[PDB]
Amino acid sequence: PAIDAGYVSQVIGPVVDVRFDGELPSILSSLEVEGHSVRLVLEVAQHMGDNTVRCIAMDSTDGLVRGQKVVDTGSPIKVPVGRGTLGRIMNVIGEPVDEQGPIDAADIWSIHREAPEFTEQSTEQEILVTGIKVVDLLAPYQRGGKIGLFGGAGVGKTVLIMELINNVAKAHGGFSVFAGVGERTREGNDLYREMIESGVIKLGAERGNSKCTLVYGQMNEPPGARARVALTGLTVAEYFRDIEGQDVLLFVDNIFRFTQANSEVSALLGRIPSAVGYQPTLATDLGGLQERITTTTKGSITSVQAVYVPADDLTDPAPATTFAHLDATTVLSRSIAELGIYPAVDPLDSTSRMLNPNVIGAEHYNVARGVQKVLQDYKNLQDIIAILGMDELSEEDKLTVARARKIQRFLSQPFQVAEVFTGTPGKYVDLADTISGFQGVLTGKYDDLPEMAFYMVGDIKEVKEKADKMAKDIASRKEADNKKVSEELKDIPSLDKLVSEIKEVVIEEDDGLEEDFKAEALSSETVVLNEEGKSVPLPKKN
Amino acid sequence: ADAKALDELRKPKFSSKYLIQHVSQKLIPAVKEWEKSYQPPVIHLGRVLSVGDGIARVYGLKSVQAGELVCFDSGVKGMALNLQADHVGVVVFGNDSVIHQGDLVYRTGQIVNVPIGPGTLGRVTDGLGQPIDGKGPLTNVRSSLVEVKAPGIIARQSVREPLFTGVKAVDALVPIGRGQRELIIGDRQTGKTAVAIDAIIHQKNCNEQVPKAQRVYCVYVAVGQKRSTVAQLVKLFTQTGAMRYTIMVSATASDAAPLQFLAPYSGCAMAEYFRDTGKHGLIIYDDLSKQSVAYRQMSLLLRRPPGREAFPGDVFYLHSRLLERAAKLSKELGGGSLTAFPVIETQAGDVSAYIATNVISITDGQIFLETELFYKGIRPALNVGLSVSRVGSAAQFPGMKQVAGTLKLELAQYREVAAFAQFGSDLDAATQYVLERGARLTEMLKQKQFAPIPIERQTVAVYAATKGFLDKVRVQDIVAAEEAVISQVNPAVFKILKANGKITPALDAHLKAELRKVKLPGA
């Protein structure tokens, strides 16, 4: 009980130093702190050198005293994995935070492991149809690949990642894991409640028929919990890939917050900071996590990760390092969103490795490369169109600006998760309707239609449905004077009879503020503790 | 020099005691002649080793909790940030010029507290809960921690109820739900406070008309402001009667940077009294961009490595752990709520700055206040194309939701048509309907300060504008046509629209009838 039970030696925010009198814990070991108000586990990060470990708190450290007993659990953070974890919400240390009882577990896996080996990789590319036009055309997603959605605070990468949950994750037929890393807790409640009414999560005795397990380390957590909750989301996804042997969908909302939480911690671990202010170990910290999120020869993980870009800077080293770890990068722009185009996907900055004529076919590939060619040549014109206007263009170039304004609107589409605030019902567009529709605008079959008919429509059947409506409206606009339902006697009572049908409510006048409240009698003096711990008034000197 | 060689020096290895026995009889006489030169030793108390930059290094304090109130013998509070092996670094809640090296540091035994309760309502307190309005101590109150963790996923529910701002552009286009945090972001001098003050005045008008459980108790946190601005604001709340429901937490520009850093957590803890007891709070953090500058000062004076714009790495966690406490609680937790309005000042309209984009990633919507619309007299200068409220939409007034769908759309066309041709190339008759209706609705939405409008007078005024009833007036007397509308219609039509919530078809053509017998000033 004396050795292998260390004591808290110093506390600097999220970073605790524990001194062990003998047998130091290994690096990445979990350490419980005895006598804290909540369960405080500490993950050993460094051996400092004088029988001291430096460790990271997975909860708050306000309350730690410099003698507090710390027991070593002899192993890393081990979280419940299995089919019993489906339909549950876990935090970083595997505790259920959904009040549904304890998580019955097939196994309790540590959240730290190595990547699958090079002999364990699987090199197969089949497409993942998402129903999104700009995605399925220009940067198509791979069915076992890594997908990154790059965004700059309000450009739409949570709406896009909830749309992929809506489109892909129901027709997938496998298990999903949603690791929420450092995002809003309101959004964790929204997804959890909307999965219960979708039947993706089933509560009670039918819990085993759930298809999704949630791991949440949201933005109220201390930076140790947000730095490790991506790792316990993968461990749940890796059990379904390795042991259960099946196809998983991992959705990681803001994998940037993993990098940012290690950057809050790294200042206090005594490290010289790297470029912009990040950890010196940014690429290997992120690399060690991302290399675990792969498709192996035993199972598949289709990983969609939102990547926040800070201050809209794509050269920031946390977005810039992530780009190499992904098979498909969907870059969402702020200027595209200010033109009202949603999803705000930059068509000339989003990239897939599936855009290859031997993978998606030459008809799909030539449309995507032709769409990108007129959008690029239009971008080359925008300096002149701003200054000189379109009147100074060649009419060869005016056909570019006319077509590229049309496909820019046609890349946008309504979402079935955005209908609750936009009003417009959402359109799943099939891949064959995407390819044929943009091929028509490139050849010139739809230069008749105005450029606003292409805006927020499903496929090329519906731009003709919307252009007909636009033409029809410009003719019929008014002549609704009377002989409608607004007659002052048919459907309508007296106005003063409606006053009396109001149920008048009673108003209580007293504000209800002192019904249960108990007031601490605060003293007229600052109450302090003397050398013997006694509650004493503040003595009188300086 | 390893510890294997140093822990051999535990066991005695001298075998010759001719100097141990000698000085053991002369040491206590030696110390006794130097006792007026010894400060008394310190183990559970503290003694200040170094003070400067607003950080004290305190020897001793063997059993301080991390992050608890310590009290200097000068009477100043501190907070034990880092407990080190040899000292404790405390951050001084006040002026560090009154702390000396050698001063006693006393332990209060509690993590940092503010008085919360019903008796903090009405008062002007500082960043630590000590009242500065001069009218006594806080009574009918109890202490609560300022660093509570936000409620989790299962302790929350969806945002259902509307928080009426009384601002016409806000409650129509960017409507605020009742557990929702909403950023007010704009340049200097753009009406950012005026939107937050009109919300606080408006809740006073509604608390005498709701049955005690739907009462909003506002809290205004002023970080980094001038003390004359705060005193002019307390006078405005006192003369409108809004201080009966308002707490005013003030850490001004002359206060210490740890007081300005702590003041939004102090005020959030006072507003979390109403969230936790089933009531409803409204917290305003005026210049949360000034609270990050105060925290950047403390982090650089603690010699922590700066990142982008020299802000620390955890300046996101500074604001995210704060604004996450603005929640709508579930019904087993009382159903209470707290809605936040952070204010971020922007430099030259640059929304892609560091602290601005941090709070956009935290909050649920924005109210962008454009400098260019504010110079044209369109006040509140609400950038309609950029201001969002997605949590508060489908939680708004059902009558306003009927008429503002056309209002947002006719403004959506108005921005799109004005994007094409503002200078007179050629004017269509269809697009000059849009510029005639768009300038109608823009003059409709601009309202003047410190007079928030009820939501039933606000639905009717937009009903009179998205429909006909105002196309006669050009653009100029539309402000005078609104009180021509809202005073000349029968005041019973505001009572049925309030009590039903929406425009029934019985009230629909009644209100068409009252809007045809109002006399419009443009004739």
Ligand SMILES: Nc1ncnc2c1ncn2[C@@H]1O[C@H](COP(=O)(O)OP(=O)(O)OP(=O)(O)O)[C@@H](O)[C@H]1O
């Ligand atoms: N709706 C309005 N109608 C008319 N005048 C207004 C309105 N709102 C604000 N003003 C005036 O414009 C100025 C803006 O003041 P306010 O304090 O609201 O802006 P602010 O953005 O908080 O400025 P600061 O950043 O300096 O605090 C004030 O002088 C105010 O009197």
Ligand SMILES: Nc1ncnc2c1ncn2[C@@H]1O[C@H](COP(=O)(O)OP(=O)(O)O)[C@@H](O)[C@H]1O
């Ligand atoms: N596909 C979309 N359709 C309509 N509006 C959208 C779409 N994507 C984003 N938005 C708007 O932009 C805001 C961005 O929100 P969110 O997607 O949560 O941003 P973030 O990328 O910061 O997570 C949304 O609240 C919504 O108003």
Ligand SMILES: [Mg+2]
């Ligand atoms: Mg998001």
Ligand SMILES: [Mg+2]
């Ligand atoms: Mg102001």
